[PDB]
Amino acid sequence: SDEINELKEMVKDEHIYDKLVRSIAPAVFGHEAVKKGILLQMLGGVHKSTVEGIKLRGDINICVVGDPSTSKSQFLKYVVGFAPRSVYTSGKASSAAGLTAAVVIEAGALMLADNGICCIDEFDKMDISDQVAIHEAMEQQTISIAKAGIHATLNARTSILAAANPVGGRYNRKLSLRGNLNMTAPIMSRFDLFFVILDDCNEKIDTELASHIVDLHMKRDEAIEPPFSAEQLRRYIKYARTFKPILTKEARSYLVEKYKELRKDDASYRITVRQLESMIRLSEAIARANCVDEITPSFIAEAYDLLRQSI
Amino acid sequence: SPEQTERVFQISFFNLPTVHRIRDIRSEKIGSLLSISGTVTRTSEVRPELYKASFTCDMCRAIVDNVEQSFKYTEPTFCPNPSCENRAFWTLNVTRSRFLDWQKVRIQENANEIPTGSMPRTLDVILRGDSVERAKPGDRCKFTGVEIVVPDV
Amino acid sequence: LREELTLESLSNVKANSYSEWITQPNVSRTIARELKSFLLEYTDETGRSVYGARIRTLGEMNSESLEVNYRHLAESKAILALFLAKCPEEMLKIFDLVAMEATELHYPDYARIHSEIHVRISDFPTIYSLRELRESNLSSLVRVTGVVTRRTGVFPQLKYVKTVYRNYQRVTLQEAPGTVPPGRLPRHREVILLADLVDVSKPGEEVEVTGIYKNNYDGNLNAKNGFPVFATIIEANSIKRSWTEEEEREFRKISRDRGIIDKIISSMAPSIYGHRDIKTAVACSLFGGVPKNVNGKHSIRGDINVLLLGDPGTAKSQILKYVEKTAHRAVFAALVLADKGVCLIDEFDQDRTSIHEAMEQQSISISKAGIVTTLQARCSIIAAANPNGGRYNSTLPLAQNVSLTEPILSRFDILCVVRDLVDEEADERLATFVVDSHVRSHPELQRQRKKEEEISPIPQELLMKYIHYARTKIYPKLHQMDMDKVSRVYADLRRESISTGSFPITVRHLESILRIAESFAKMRLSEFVSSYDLDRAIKVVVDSFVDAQKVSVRRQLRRSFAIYTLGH
DNA sequence: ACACACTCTCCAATTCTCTAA
DNA sequence: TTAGAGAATTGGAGAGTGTGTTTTTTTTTTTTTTT
Ligand SMILES: Nc1ncnc2c1ncn2[C@@H]1O[C@H](COP(=O)(O)OP(=O)(O)NP(=O)(O)O)[C@@H](O)[C@H]1O
Ligand SMILES: [Mg+2]
């Protein structure tokens, strides 16, 4: 009863969405865009299939690129420390057998992360021979085994969160993300969002960031003061994932206009039909975050604005 | 209906004073009541274990009942009818004998507890009755029961 | 001995267990009399005794297995159904010995045809996966579903321990992937198949099984586990997985209507917008031509092979998935499994080498360690590829955009290139269709009917039956009048190709034109090729040939070829 | 042929019983 | 009340018999031919 009362109280708030974004990864200074992306991945879209029997992917894949000391691995550390179904893996110290499944049959990392978040750190160090295995699994959300007279097929409904280094260690503003990143085009085509982190030296930011860091070393718990408790936030996220929202009429009209705008900006990775499907996924997750059963067009404006920061 | 066999009750305990690590299992505690925690890494399929047995003789019409097994498959020592001396060619009556559900699972130490410069140890655990298939690979669990010693059968 | 029980007397089990009650002589005789009285007497609502009609057909096929539905046995004399569920191994012995009496009542001296008959049970009203089985199920009848993972060869086995034998085979059964819960590995079981049931199923099939659940001692299990642990197996009792005149008349009715070709193409791949030429080519490959051979030095395949060069995200993988669900038999990526079917390739040295041999031949041959053997391919190949990196270059010929040898481009019947072109109106049409399809699919009878009929102009069940009917029944031929014009057009195309300095048109293209014309005739169930079929085939092949060329050559070709690509 | 597990057989060691001094 | 002559029961000495034994990965360091 008290849990229901507390949940109802925070559900009723006008400013719930902003507080939720602000409560992801309390120790990291700034970078609200990545925190918002992490929340929407954690909530996820709505899985569905057509009359033809073809399935439509209901979940969100994210990749983070940055030059050194940008604290990008802290997001992976938070996610694997928070999300109920999750695994952390390093691109250098792992094998295709250990990632998918191996004969001994025993489960790999992607199997344990079924209906969960799978974290890959220093993705750019992974061998091509193993990147293709992740690509094949990500294409189908399915894993296949056939050897030594034993055959098996397994389900892998797992969302991927990845981190990588730009080639040469520092990003080149003269070049496309494809030029900067050691990743093949089919794999790059399958991340819903890309985030690029840069130092952008500025005294007014440095003076504050240094203070924040020194406070963390000076006081252990006291510095962060998050909007919500972790055990409060997990109950909210569990509650939110019960909603299955529906796309409003006006939102359908609005989506094609925003997609036409993206296509005219495109006329940099070339914008395909997949970006519209991804934008729909993000809008589903946004409506779910707000505990609303209708996709208001404002959510699509939010999704479009968020997506264009990746371009 | 025909006659109905007896219910095999199970006593269970919880909220014991303290939880040990896999690394704290030591032969001085054999046969005591304990509680343990770790991450599951493998599980076996459910198998039927023979609990009580009943046999009948080939050379004469005689029956032996309620034979007790422990760790190895065990059979009678004599023909109970003194008109016959055959010890061979027993058969196990599957209708009259009684079985139990049995499952093997395997666990390893919690990663955050491993001491300096060391690596995680593992252990094999037995599950029976209404608790089989409750455990799942990759999950974290807490167990309670008694530690035992198994021979070279 | 002489006296018999009433059916009401069997309501009380009087012995300490079921099996020890069924096996008594007076009880057993009573059960035998009652089962025979059921089998000679059960009826449809129309009278029309079903089992008298099944025994009749048992001899008409010289068969060995009588099939009994469980619901019928539960609808009257219910206690026998209960006993069957509890003690199948006894009940089926009595039931088999009754079935032989009933069959000999139709066919005296049937014992000379087969010495013994087996009753097969069907529609058992409760189901388990391989999770829910427990020790309480032992020696009970069970009904189970899964995928057959592995199959042994067939062997004879000694029946009695003068000699007699029976056939034997073991099958491994695995949980279907849709049933397995998330984050868990699938379970396995092994099934024993005896005399009439061997080779009833093939590896990779999804199968449903009824049988006894049984166990035995095994020394190795006990030794390795260190506990008195028994092993378990399933002994199968039964295993489970055309058209009327009305369908034929309906097919002929729709084929008699004008524009049926266009409607079939329109019905192709409903969920994908645009790309009509790709749908046309796929339909042509699924219908195919007719194979021919002349022992004087030549042979011609009926299969039609298609290759599609795809820009990233231009619907290629979806149409391959659509074809995989549409087609009767197929392989997706092994060519043995594609025999008389369609083979699907969505991305791409030994693999290419195998395809080189496969396109040259129609049958495959191999030798190893002095062994020699042959296999059949006999299949239509649909392939797709990414054009040498991120984007196709239209200023260049096709070879610059692919990683293929020249004879591949020669031996594919149809080649096509699909590109993500820029147009505001096309983008708006695509986006509106996409969001509309997305809403129409949302998890939140009349609704289905409206949805279906808006989706396609033909119900796809009828279209699949129509494709199968056309493939099995229709075998078109050419008409000898217009072939002079075809020869003149072939010569003209060759002359024009040489005149602009193009790579020349060849006999392979002419053969492909005739084969595609046969396929177009087959699509409307016509046993004759016609002038419009040749015109459409000519347009398809000429346009495909033009698309392969460099830009300046492309302009000269289309300026001259206007009387074929657009006019005729 | 070389250690073992198991079966068979005969012989004398032992205790019990009866009789008379 | 002792003791000695005869009968019955049991133990295990030891002799005999049959028996069993030899004997597709997956991960990681290093050399070699191939593009
Ligand atoms: N009418 C359509 N036209 C184009 N794309 C569509 C259409 N409808 C859906 N899509 C989506 O766009 C993609 C269709 O092309 P498809 O080839 O299946 O994608 P892809 O396999 O990821 N690209 P690729 O890996 O190069 O084959 C899928 O992501 C579809 O969900
Ligand atoms: Mg594709």
Ligand SMILES: [Zn+2]
């Ligand atoms: Zn006996």
